[PDB]
């Protein structure tokens, strides 16, 4: 069964793309002070699971959901800011820029690896099509 | 049939190589999944089992309106980890890439040998 590899690699590519998009969103708004409803921008992450439902124990990756980091938000001092609490502290995102850069690089290389796997399997089955010449 | 028996080995080996390629692709796709233990199969023992046992008991279809057996199996062995990772991910990418390349090459070999057998039979039949 090699056709399942198309499904496996496609799922992996989609999930790595989602991971990179989440990393880019975290890295872009690492300095945003407010959201649209006045709440701070909390860093988002993806949750990876195994697509063992169609199979038994070997499947691709699926992104179950996008979770929001519950680590305490950074506090800065700004009593003039309207969003400051009773103590004068404004919440700021808890983004780790080095972590986001490393995550972007990792999603990139994994994406490339799964592309190579997909290409190799496609060539293998194209050559399988000419069995017996 | 004898035409099946003479061609059985390379066909079964090719099918097993396809299944193991699926497993290796699952291992590579899960390269960043936390808590995922890399899985594989022992090709030689599994192929020996496939030849010895057979690819179980088919029920008796008494009448044409009887229903035949419907659908229902390799032993997935864990790969020993090389180095420990904090996220519990066992997939070592160097070994996985090496085994993927080797499996692809052996699959091409099986295709070529099976095609050689079939073409030899066809050239025998050619009058």
């Amino acid at each position: 069964a090699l056709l399942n590899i198309f499904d496996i690699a496609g799922s992996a590519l989609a999930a790595q793309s989602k991971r990179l998009n989440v990393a880019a969103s975290n890295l872009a708004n690492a300095d945003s002070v407010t959201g649209p409803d006045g709440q701070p921008y909390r860093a988002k992450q993806v949750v990876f699971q195994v697509d063992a439902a169609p199979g038994q124990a070997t499947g691709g990756v699926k992104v179950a959901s996008v979770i929001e980091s519950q680590a305490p938000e950074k506090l800065v001092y700004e009593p003039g800011n309207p969003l400051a609490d009773a103590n004068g502290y404004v919440k700021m995102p808890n983004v780790d820029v080095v972590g986001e850069m490393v995550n972007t690089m990792s999603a990139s290389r994994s994406y490339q690896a799964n592309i190579e796997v997909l290409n190799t399997v496609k060539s293998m089955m194209l050559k399988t099509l000419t069995l017996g010449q | 049939d004898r035409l099946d028996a003479a061609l059985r080995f390379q066909q079964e080996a090719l099918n097993l190589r396809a299944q193991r390629q699926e497993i290796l692709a699952a291992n590579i796709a899960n390269a960043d999944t936390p808590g995922y233990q890399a899985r594989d199969i022992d090709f030689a023992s599994e192929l020996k089992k496939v030849m010895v046992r057979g690819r179980g008991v088919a029920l008796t279809l008494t009448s044409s309106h009887h229903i035949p057996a419907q659908a229902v199996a390799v032993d997935l062995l864990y790969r020993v980890p090389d180095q420990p990772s904090l996220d519990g991910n066992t997939v070592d990418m160097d070994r996985e890439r090496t085994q993927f390349a080797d499996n692809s090459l052996k699959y091409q070999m099986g295709l070529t040998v099976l095609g050689s057998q079939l073409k030899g039979m066809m050239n025998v039949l050619q009058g």
Partner: peptide, 16 residues
Amino acid sequence: PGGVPGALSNQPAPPN
């Protein structure tokens, strides 16, 4: 089964 891949699962964390 799995969790966050990469940064948030590859650092020493307090037990919880």
